[PDB]
XYZ file of C-alpha atoms in Angstrom:
690
model
C 42.437 60.376 -5.733
C 44.137 63.765 -7.396
C 44.100 67.002 -5.902
C 41.627 68.289 -3.330
C 37.858 69.254 -4.450
C 35.522 71.698 -2.756
C 31.757 71.221 -2.319
C 29.169 74.377 -1.611
C 27.869 72.589 1.872
C 28.741 73.322 5.185
C 28.008 71.737 8.618
C 25.252 72.890 10.270
C 24.308 72.820 13.958
C 21.439 73.580 16.510
C 22.093 73.734 20.102
C 20.543 76.200 21.726
C 21.166 76.973 25.319
C 16.901 77.404 26.020
C 16.555 73.761 24.944
C 13.055 74.588 25.854
C 9.865 74.166 22.793
C 6.517 73.785 23.247
C 4.307 70.597 21.651
C 1.440 70.613 19.525
C -0.592 67.011 18.631
C -3.734 67.446 16.596
C -7.240 66.716 17.600
C -7.874 64.171 13.956
C -5.256 62.534 12.239
C -2.505 63.862 9.907
C -3.530 65.153 6.476
C -0.116 64.948 5.540
C 0.098 67.252 2.631
C -1.547 69.656 4.790
C 1.026 68.910 7.114
C 3.319 70.805 5.903
C 0.891 73.980 5.522
C -0.400 73.518 8.962
C 3.124 74.020 10.442
C 3.491 77.441 8.178
C 0.237 78.299 9.485
C 1.354 77.617 13.078
C 4.395 79.673 12.455
C 2.941 82.317 11.643
C 0.240 82.198 13.920
C 3.016 81.620 17.025
C 5.197 84.200 15.419
C 7.915 81.073 16.365
C 9.714 78.441 13.943
C 8.319 75.699 14.005
C 9.189 72.374 12.789
C 7.520 69.220 12.529
C 7.856 65.613 13.550
C 5.158 62.818 13.333
C 2.047 64.690 14.312
C 3.945 66.873 17.014
C 4.340 70.805 15.988
C 7.834 72.006 18.249
C 8.030 76.177 18.330
C 11.237 77.626 18.939
C 9.525 78.847 22.040
C 7.072 79.595 24.618
C 3.773 79.428 24.124
C 0.722 79.642 26.085
C -2.827 78.419 24.838
C -3.844 75.120 25.714
C -4.560 74.940 22.069
C -4.638 77.018 18.887
C -6.748 77.122 16.135
C -5.449 77.557 12.934
C -7.614 78.471 9.735
C -5.816 76.655 6.699
C -5.886 77.524 2.991
C -9.082 75.583 2.353
C -10.816 77.704 5.051
C -10.753 74.267 6.910
C -10.165 74.994 10.690
C -7.428 72.413 12.036
C -7.437 72.770 16.054
C -3.938 71.787 17.402
C -4.106 70.574 21.120
C -1.063 72.033 22.898
C 0.730 69.223 24.883
C 3.563 69.959 27.173
C 7.138 70.916 26.560
C 9.747 69.276 25.404
C 13.765 69.739 26.149
C 15.133 69.863 22.484
C 17.858 67.128 21.647
C 19.270 67.568 17.613
C 16.793 67.074 15.047
C 15.852 63.679 13.823
C 15.917 64.236 9.712
C 17.040 66.868 7.741
C 13.807 67.945 7.199
C 12.982 69.360 10.819
C 16.691 71.045 10.417
C 15.786 72.664 6.792
C 12.280 73.664 8.200
C 13.309 75.045 11.691
C 16.250 76.807 9.541
C 13.904 78.457 6.839
C 12.380 80.085 9.677
C 14.931 81.974 11.401
C 15.880 82.990 8.083
C 12.554 84.591 7.872
C 11.987 86.189 11.044
C 15.356 87.124 10.676
C 14.624 88.907 7.518
C 18.609 87.980 6.795
C 18.218 86.588 3.353
C 16.160 89.833 2.196
C 18.738 92.462 4.235
C 21.207 90.329 1.786
C 19.248 91.168 -1.459
C 18.319 94.219 -0.049
C 22.104 96.017 -0.235
C 22.930 93.519 -3.054
C 20.897 95.610 -4.914
C 21.966 98.772 -4.277
C 25.552 97.930 -3.363
C 25.517 96.730 -6.727
C 22.665 98.096 -8.896
C 25.988 100.150 -10.073
C 25.446 98.106 -13.098
C 23.360 94.939 -12.749
C 20.795 96.398 -15.215
C 21.902 97.160 -18.811
C 20.704 99.582 -21.343
C 21.988 97.902 -24.989
C 19.309 99.097 -28.368
C 16.352 96.271 -28.023
C 15.995 97.039 -24.271
C 17.788 93.679 -18.892
C 18.114 92.902 -15.336
C 19.748 90.578 -13.270
C 17.841 88.649 -10.619
C 19.874 87.177 -7.611
C 18.226 84.238 -6.966
C 19.225 82.403 -3.466
C 18.734 79.019 -2.263
C 19.310 77.224 1.104
C 19.292 73.192 1.297
C 20.164 71.406 4.145
C 21.236 67.393 2.952
C 22.759 64.900 5.465
C 25.900 62.551 5.213
C 27.560 59.287 5.241
C 29.164 60.694 8.486
C 26.031 62.001 10.439
C 26.230 65.499 10.540
C 23.521 68.172 8.582
C 24.845 69.924 6.081
C 24.177 73.742 4.641
C 23.968 73.698 1.139
C 24.184 76.877 0.052
C 24.234 78.387 -3.652
C 23.415 81.789 -5.444
C 22.590 81.643 -9.264
C 21.451 85.091 -11.507
C 18.647 84.857 -13.625
C 18.848 87.473 -16.397
C 14.999 88.786 -17.516
C 14.197 91.963 -18.895
C 12.876 94.780 -17.359
C 9.578 94.256 -20.006
C 7.328 91.706 -20.381
C 5.724 88.924 -22.583
C 2.426 90.908 -23.007
C 4.317 94.420 -24.332
C 6.904 91.564 -26.931
C 3.821 90.290 -28.372
C 2.820 93.698 -30.187
C 6.227 94.531 -31.448
C 8.117 88.426 -32.010
C 8.188 84.527 -32.351
C 7.873 83.604 -29.565
C 8.061 79.682 -29.297
C 10.723 77.650 -27.354
C 10.907 80.832 -24.346
C 12.064 80.505 -20.943
C 9.968 82.711 -19.183
C 8.338 83.773 -15.576
C 5.338 84.039 -14.014
C 5.588 87.179 -11.646
C 4.460 85.655 -8.599
C 4.948 82.357 -9.549
C 8.204 80.634 -8.868
C 8.493 78.524 -12.075
C 10.237 78.625 -15.399
C 8.264 77.363 -18.479
C 8.479 77.072 -22.146
C 6.175 78.808 -24.519
C 4.112 76.589 -26.859
C 1.488 78.115 -28.846
C 0.116 82.279 -27.801
C -3.268 82.247 -28.810
C -5.934 85.261 -28.488
C -7.800 85.567 -24.880
C -11.371 86.564 -26.545
C -11.439 83.091 -28.183
C -12.223 81.575 -24.579
C -15.374 83.281 -24.527
C -15.770 84.351 -20.517
C -16.377 81.132 -18.385
C -13.101 79.902 -18.983
C -11.741 82.856 -17.109
C -14.360 82.304 -14.173
C -12.605 78.586 -13.082
C -8.802 79.239 -13.526
C -9.629 82.498 -11.796
C -10.574 80.498 -8.386
C -7.719 77.666 -9.053
C -5.390 80.200 -8.346
C -2.945 80.609 -5.633
C -0.633 83.272 -7.152
C -1.444 87.343 -6.446
C -0.225 87.473 -9.791
C -2.448 84.302 -11.152
C -5.492 85.400 -9.278
C -5.802 89.308 -9.762
C -4.369 88.485 -13.445
C -7.250 86.310 -14.228
C -9.489 88.362 -12.132
C -8.802 91.208 -14.481
C -9.496 89.903 -17.454
C -13.100 88.710 -16.488
C -14.341 91.307 -14.870
C -13.201 93.717 -18.236
C -14.679 92.450 -21.728
C -12.875 95.418 -22.927
C -9.408 94.155 -22.558
C -10.146 90.573 -23.039
C -9.694 91.015 -26.685
C -5.969 93.148 -27.053
C -4.167 90.486 -24.877
C -2.936 87.305 -25.571
C -2.947 83.755 -23.507
C 0.221 82.235 -23.340
C 0.278 78.318 -23.027
C 3.580 77.204 -21.344
C -0.713 75.284 -17.589
C -0.824 78.635 -18.684
C -1.468 82.074 -17.896
C -1.469 85.536 -19.413
C 1.266 86.974 -21.437
C 0.739 90.343 -18.801
C 2.238 88.354 -15.878
C 5.149 86.501 -18.050
C 8.637 87.960 -18.328
C 11.353 86.236 -20.531
C 14.153 84.665 -18.742
C 17.104 84.742 -20.578
C 20.614 82.630 -21.446
C 23.833 83.856 -22.260
C 26.904 93.376 -26.031
C 27.451 90.891 -23.344
C 29.141 92.889 -20.859
C 27.774 91.973 -17.427
C 28.619 88.190 -16.831
C 28.751 87.027 -13.358
C 32.306 85.594 -13.932
C 34.291 82.556 -12.792
C 34.041 80.133 -9.323
C 36.479 81.625 -7.540
C 34.570 84.434 -6.816
C 31.414 82.620 -7.073
C 32.796 80.373 -4.284
C 33.712 83.681 -2.168
C 30.665 85.188 -2.846
C 28.519 82.226 -0.649
C 31.180 82.363 1.183
C 30.336 85.934 2.050
C 26.319 85.046 2.527
C 27.487 82.088 4.728
C 29.020 84.500 7.112
C 26.071 87.282 7.378
C 23.835 84.037 7.888
C 25.753 83.403 10.863
C 25.781 86.774 12.420
C 22.050 86.735 12.213
C 21.816 83.260 13.446
C 24.949 82.983 15.939
C 22.746 84.319 18.950
C 20.044 81.883 18.702
C 22.232 78.952 19.016
C 22.969 77.785 15.249
C 26.047 76.943 13.833
C 27.354 76.975 10.704
C 31.195 75.503 9.629
C 33.174 78.222 7.947
C 35.179 76.071 6.055
C 33.990 74.024 2.622
C 33.462 70.097 2.555
C 35.846 68.274 0.113
C 35.202 64.857 -1.790
C 35.516 61.748 0.529
C 38.152 60.329 -2.327
C 38.199 59.483 -6.053
C 36.061 56.165 -6.792
C 37.824 53.570 -9.285
C 35.397 51.763 -12.459
C 36.420 49.668 -14.894
C 37.075 52.194 -18.226
C 38.685 49.276 -20.725
C 37.141 48.815 -24.104
C 37.649 46.379 -26.879
C 36.229 46.094 -29.652
C 35.275 42.809 -32.085
C 38.688 40.997 -32.191
C 39.889 41.201 -28.608
C 42.151 44.463 -28.720
C 41.829 46.217 -26.015
C 42.845 49.891 -24.518
C 44.662 47.755 -21.364
C 47.022 47.289 -24.472
C 47.083 49.901 -27.205
C 46.760 52.574 -24.880
C 46.798 55.587 -26.852
C 42.795 56.067 -27.836
C 43.664 57.436 -31.333
C 45.736 54.793 -31.756
C 42.987 51.980 -31.085
C 40.013 54.101 -32.900
C 42.042 53.948 -35.680
C 42.730 50.308 -35.462
C 39.479 49.054 -33.975
C 37.674 45.883 -35.429
C 33.486 47.544 -35.368
C 31.182 44.848 -33.924
C 29.357 45.872 -37.147
C 26.039 44.670 -37.984
C 24.619 46.816 -40.591
C 26.887 45.695 -43.644
C 26.091 48.781 -46.148
C 24.649 51.750 -45.119
C 22.257 54.661 -46.723
C 23.156 58.378 -45.929
C 22.025 61.953 -47.052
C 24.044 64.284 -47.144
C 22.639 67.966 -45.973
C 25.257 70.915 -46.697
C 25.081 74.415 -45.842
C 27.045 77.048 -47.080
C 26.926 81.182 -47.275
C 27.874 82.387 -50.468
C 28.644 80.717 -53.670
C 31.823 78.965 -52.613
C 33.200 75.435 -52.991
C 33.818 73.051 -50.928
C 36.734 70.476 -51.821
C 36.934 70.177 -47.764
C 33.606 68.606 -47.356
C 34.309 66.324 -50.351
C 37.816 65.635 -49.233
C 36.879 64.391 -45.309
C 33.119 62.725 -47.523
C 36.111 60.847 -49.300
C 38.099 60.331 -46.960
C 35.176 58.984 -44.372
C 33.785 56.450 -46.725
C 36.801 55.090 -46.959
C 38.046 55.059 -43.634
C 34.650 53.490 -42.619
C 35.068 50.788 -45.576
C 38.776 50.017 -44.381
C 36.433 48.694 -41.158
C 34.000 46.793 -43.395
C 31.089 49.359 -43.718
C 30.246 50.414 -47.232
C 28.286 53.927 -46.558
C 26.511 54.240 -49.732
C 25.647 57.488 -50.622
C 22.125 58.677 -51.247
C 20.618 62.010 -51.501
C 22.922 65.269 -51.389
C 21.269 68.500 -50.933
C 23.293 71.635 -51.157
C 21.677 74.797 -49.411
C 23.208 78.236 -49.398
C 22.203 81.322 -47.190
C 23.691 84.048 -45.065
C 21.354 84.516 -41.826
C 18.789 82.124 -40.449
C 16.554 81.287 -43.462
C 18.755 78.201 -43.252
C 16.141 77.300 -40.598
C 13.463 78.268 -43.416
C 15.753 76.663 -46.249
C 16.497 73.412 -44.151
C 13.402 73.188 -42.641
C 12.700 71.129 -45.991
C 15.508 68.978 -46.840
C 14.469 67.661 -43.497
C 10.950 67.035 -43.453
C 11.311 66.289 -47.133
C 12.686 63.300 -49.268
C 14.781 62.179 -45.273
C 12.562 59.259 -45.221
C 14.632 56.490 -43.456
C 18.257 56.041 -44.111
C 20.507 54.586 -41.664
C 22.326 58.157 -40.939
C 22.081 61.936 -42.458
C 25.494 64.099 -42.323
C 25.264 67.824 -42.169
C 27.841 70.226 -42.572
C 26.839 73.659 -41.250
C 27.891 77.247 -40.980
C 27.794 79.398 -38.149
C 26.104 82.821 -38.838
C 27.106 85.679 -36.001
C 22.463 86.347 -34.383
C 21.579 85.939 -30.923
C 17.688 85.820 -30.682
C 17.089 88.384 -27.922
C 14.575 85.799 -26.169
C 14.379 82.477 -27.898
C 17.061 80.213 -28.271
C 17.962 79.113 -31.912
C 21.064 77.735 -33.408
C 21.306 75.376 -36.645
C 23.388 72.607 -34.387
C 20.450 72.318 -32.035
C 17.858 72.678 -34.826
C 19.036 69.934 -37.380
C 19.697 67.673 -34.014
C 15.936 67.964 -32.495
C 14.132 68.205 -36.037
C 16.157 64.533 -36.669
C 15.831 63.304 -33.248
C 11.736 63.964 -34.107
C 12.443 62.090 -37.283
C 14.169 59.382 -35.307
C 16.967 59.531 -38.063
C 20.788 59.066 -36.509
C 22.545 61.872 -37.539
C 26.268 63.696 -37.352
C 26.589 67.414 -37.802
C 29.773 68.749 -38.805
C 30.642 72.102 -38.092
C 32.798 73.538 -41.550
C 34.230 75.576 -39.021
C 36.007 72.660 -37.379
C 36.780 71.467 -41.100
C 38.638 74.324 -41.916
C 41.006 74.685 -38.379
C 41.563 70.708 -36.950
C 42.958 68.101 -38.008
C 41.512 66.033 -40.780
C 42.473 62.839 -39.411
C 41.908 63.487 -35.090
C 38.323 64.616 -36.766
C 38.030 61.704 -39.240
C 38.515 59.424 -35.938
C 36.411 61.918 -34.025
C 33.342 61.251 -36.152
C 34.043 57.867 -37.127
C 33.693 56.873 -33.642
C 30.398 58.986 -33.257
C 28.758 57.860 -36.271
C 29.848 53.867 -36.074
C 27.909 53.525 -33.208
C 24.744 55.978 -34.184
C 24.378 53.453 -36.765
C 24.395 49.902 -35.041
C 27.583 49.207 -35.839
C 29.877 50.075 -32.392
C 33.444 50.632 -32.830
C 33.868 48.580 -29.171
C 32.113 47.858 -25.963
C 33.228 47.184 -22.083
C 35.803 44.740 -21.091
C 33.466 44.022 -18.361
C 31.858 46.065 -15.618
C 32.653 45.783 -11.851
C 30.187 43.524 -10.163
C 27.861 41.125 -11.574
C 24.641 42.483 -13.620
C 23.303 40.925 -16.265
C 21.218 44.458 -17.665
C 21.412 47.900 -17.248
C 17.787 49.444 -18.021
C 17.023 52.945 -18.297
C 13.901 54.502 -18.178
C 12.289 57.830 -17.917
C 8.550 58.201 -17.510
C 7.075 62.022 -18.508
C 3.519 62.609 -18.139
C 2.014 65.551 -19.475
C -1.012 67.077 -17.030
C -3.787 69.053 -17.594
C -5.509 69.600 -14.421
C -6.554 66.253 -12.267
C -4.375 63.286 -12.391
C -2.702 62.876 -15.706
C -3.769 62.993 -19.272
C -1.383 61.039 -21.148
C 2.554 60.389 -21.187
C 5.380 58.784 -22.724
C 8.234 56.095 -21.684
C 11.636 55.658 -22.892
C 13.319 52.673 -21.868
C 17.216 51.648 -22.843
C 18.325 47.538 -22.130
C 21.862 47.114 -22.070
C 23.483 43.769 -21.588
C 26.280 43.314 -18.905
C 28.938 44.868 -21.527
C 27.459 48.069 -22.064
C 25.758 47.188 -25.855
C 22.178 48.744 -26.142
C 20.326 45.305 -26.644
C 17.136 47.483 -27.094
C 15.418 50.612 -26.568
C 10.828 51.139 -26.002
C 9.592 54.296 -26.937
C 6.020 54.942 -26.492
C 3.429 57.328 -25.325
C 0.070 55.601 -23.175
C -3.210 57.479 -23.694
C -5.421 56.474 -20.180
C -8.564 56.422 -18.825
C -7.314 55.395 -15.469
C -4.520 56.771 -13.168
C -2.847 52.688 -13.791
C -0.216 54.275 -16.158
C 2.783 53.279 -14.490
C 1.705 49.282 -13.429
C 1.446 48.803 -17.530
C 4.947 51.561 -18.286
C 6.598 49.438 -15.888
C 5.366 46.365 -17.275
C 5.930 46.752 -20.945
C 9.703 46.991 -19.413
C 9.758 43.445 -17.916
C 7.992 42.100 -20.767
C 10.904 43.084 -23.221
C 13.388 42.098 -20.628
C 12.000 38.317 -20.934
C 11.403 38.729 -24.625
C 14.932 39.324 -24.948
C 16.409 36.660 -23.097
C 16.844 37.366 -19.315
C 15.726 34.565 -16.993
C 14.788 33.526 -13.549
C 17.934 34.538 -11.511
C 18.852 37.761 -13.520
C 20.522 41.027 -11.826
C 18.625 43.742 -13.193
C 19.916 47.528 -12.622
C 17.592 49.936 -13.146
C 18.488 53.407 -14.154
C 15.433 55.697 -13.307
C 16.083 59.054 -15.301
C 14.670 62.063 -12.981
C 13.177 61.226 -9.312
C 11.491 57.607 -8.320
C 8.009 57.896 -7.355
C 6.906 55.095 -4.682
C 4.760 53.933 -6.758
C 6.922 53.067 -9.643
C 9.072 51.374 -6.617
C 6.392 49.538 -6.005
C 5.700 48.185 -9.718
C 9.208 47.541 -10.044
C 9.459 45.088 -6.940
C 5.843 43.537 -7.819
C 6.641 42.574 -11.250
C 10.339 42.023 -10.153
C 8.784 39.100 -7.810
C 6.607 37.940 -10.587
C 9.760 37.578 -13.263
C 11.656 36.465 -10.543
C 14.369 39.037 -11.359
C 16.541 40.538 -8.613
C 16.589 44.132 -8.772
C 18.659 47.487 -7.686
C 16.609 50.628 -7.948
C 18.580 54.133 -8.182
C 17.108 57.902 -9.207
C 20.040 60.006 -10.914
C 19.015 63.738 -10.063
C 20.788 65.644 -12.440
C 19.634 69.011 -11.495
C 20.063 71.491 -8.619
C 22.916 69.987 -7.130
C 26.061 70.927 -4.370
C 28.647 72.106 -7.246
C 32.629 70.766 -6.766
C 35.072 73.698 -7.292
C 38.328 72.082 -7.941
C 41.270 72.623 -9.329
C 42.333 68.922 -10.819
C 41.175 68.455 -13.947
C 40.789 65.171 -13.555
C 38.036 64.829 -10.865
C 35.788 61.995 -12.863
C 35.301 59.590 -10.160
C 35.579 62.278 -7.141
C 32.990 61.999 -4.920
C 30.777 62.725 -1.818
C 28.480 60.301 0.051
C 25.714 61.570 1.309
C 23.274 60.209 4.020
C 20.291 57.997 2.596
C 22.620 55.726 0.311
C 23.137 59.020 -1.936
C 26.346 60.019 -3.129
C 27.221 62.995 -5.257
C 29.542 62.103 -8.170
C 31.402 63.507 -10.660
C 31.364 61.529 -13.937
C 33.143 63.713 -16.185
C 36.420 65.705 -16.466
C 36.048 69.021 -16.339
C 37.693 69.775 -19.470
C 35.613 73.144 -19.870
C 36.409 76.398 -17.783
C 35.928 76.186 -14.596
C 33.201 74.865 -12.556
C 32.294 71.356 -12.178
C 28.468 70.150 -12.077
C 28.644 66.747 -10.111
C 25.466 64.911 -10.115
C 23.330 62.884 -7.268
C 22.735 58.916 -7.041
C 20.508 57.727 -4.608
C 19.877 53.715 -3.905
C 16.207 53.569 -3.865
C 16.417 49.576 -3.309
C 19.358 46.765 -4.018
C 21.414 44.562 -2.070
C 24.794 46.195 -4.051
C 27.054 48.763 -2.054
C 26.687 51.874 -3.671
C 30.039 52.053 -4.680
C 29.462 49.314 -7.233
C 26.706 51.061 -8.261
C 28.487 54.150 -8.812
C 31.415 52.374 -10.856
C 29.007 50.705 -12.586
C 27.456 54.356 -13.442
C 31.338 55.756 -14.034
C 31.615 52.444 -17.149
C 28.801 53.122 -18.886
C 29.818 57.044 -18.944
C 32.065 55.172 -21.730
C 28.939 53.757 -23.950
C 27.956 57.618 -25.004
C 31.281 56.536 -27.746
C 31.915 60.669 -27.406
C 36.092 59.975 -26.016
C 37.026 63.363 -27.036
C 34.219 65.508 -25.733
C 32.963 64.335 -21.994
C 29.796 63.756 -21.531
C 28.132 64.046 -17.778
C 25.365 60.975 -18.163
C 25.507 57.573 -18.438
C 24.232 55.989 -21.529
C 21.289 54.839 -19.654
C 19.937 58.078 -18.863
C 21.658 60.300 -21.685
C 19.308 62.069 -23.699
C 16.170 60.468 -21.377
C 14.008 63.620 -20.581
C 15.423 65.020 -23.851
C 13.561 62.560 -26.185
C 10.543 61.904 -23.559
C 9.722 65.299 -22.799
C 10.368 65.802 -26.778
C 8.059 62.964 -27.608
C 5.209 64.643 -25.889
C 3.822 66.479 -28.930
C -0.428 66.318 -30.592
C -1.808 63.143 -31.396
C 1.340 61.162 -32.120
C 0.859 57.695 -31.743
C 4.721 56.122 -30.843
C 5.462 52.456 -30.751
C 8.603 52.234 -31.189
C 11.639 49.477 -30.054
C 14.745 49.100 -32.334
C 18.857 48.667 -31.128
C 20.418 51.941 -32.235
C 21.320 54.340 -30.452
C 19.973 57.020 -32.938
C 19.838 59.473 -29.975
C 23.442 60.325 -29.325
């Protein structure tokens, strides 16, 4: 292994003295979705923390009423029949522990008492002035997880959200807004803005519907406003992130700036604090919460040896920088056409670009790739007219070449609400154009080593263009292919509308054998059956037959229906399958001084693992990911190790990458190809996304 690393996870336990709970079975059947509603109402009506088992509802206390009549939201009346009392013997799942634990936090108010005092004892400046018009909302969440071991773990994490004590309806009277993380007043969701329109435009019966389909005092009272008042209906704008009125939306802001919550050291000790109070508030009730953080079980070993088209491997030529200089690419597209876009402030002259270009073209010639230039496009600018001046070179003559190289200048700005920077801009615009791109910052050409950069690019470029410089010598375990898929669905009410699905198939050596990006407009909600289908269809049309081992990488979380479709077809094509979800959001965080923690892991219960897939060569707090084996006959250790190995296939060995080549830039593309009646039906064998 290496040197100790910590996780914001704390063993939690509930061994009360008074083990008596009152259970209540229903009269009819468990509407399940409503169950976790029915439990909440039981809490309120009963005033006792409660948790649900199958049908039974256990109340942390004595309740006398041989029947309870809780009234759900639908107004629906559910009757719970109080069965005898029970002697509590530990929770069964994490859900129980969590349900019951979150109640106490409420009946106790301890969390709010904290946010209360945090505000006072610190509002000393959680608010800033500035000349433009800033808060500091302290979001705090509690999760409960199990662990390979067997005990429960309280996942405590705190993050700060920054938004102006201003709203959107006010700003759309002063700028863009476009892609702006926003937040509805009485709602818990952060969306992005799309296109703001005038509210009058929607007649009147529009405001009727949604005004009833509201489940937020905010949304509701906000809709009613506009509905019973033609007066305002005109002067106010309706924003479409789902959609609400700009009068109940506050922009969530990202990182003049003299208010930073700083490094982890404190962060951990901050949660350490919050943990203490919690304890003090729930000790008298039988709750035991360990003061010691949880630590990585150990480091994982993965096959990390790559080789070129001649066999030269890194097991031998160990110096990666040297390797790249001697690698013999698995070239396939022998001649490349490329456009060169150049952004530069003032009427200057850049020999630096010319130097590099010549060195690149030549350095690639030495590898056997003639990089024939097609078009040069010089741009002068000093602001963000670049966006306004590049919005052309890009969506213009740039019509399929093999790559586009961009030399960017960086300007001192900051859009107070929207995220804008030529890097992200250029990149995203070329992603839609589905063209492989290499952004080279002029700041880098001026101060770095033209040689360490020449390499640094070459590797990126080669890959992006189907001339991968190397591939894995082998990966742990016998797998015939690694499939990575991401299905993203536009849901404007009801059950779906249309969707998009991106699939990438790599072989056993990590080579991208084929990708398939496609959208599915639909009638019935039978889009999964088809979507997943096309993947197997492509696996046979590729050369994989009965007996094949396929490891699949579901981007977000796997849905019951998708799992069945996989198992379903897998049966038809006779393929062996292992299913995996790879959660990249809201996971516990590692706290260490190791630096080389890549492979550091923590095993969770249901075959899940918390995996560090990258060396933290960036500040302090490391954000791992979660890997859960949904189905399959391979140890998670292997599946994890395979993921680590496949980290290498993003061909970026100087800038650490978190996700495996299989799901890297999926949500992004998938989330990105959801625009207009854009009908896409493309497959290729080039990792243009890199």
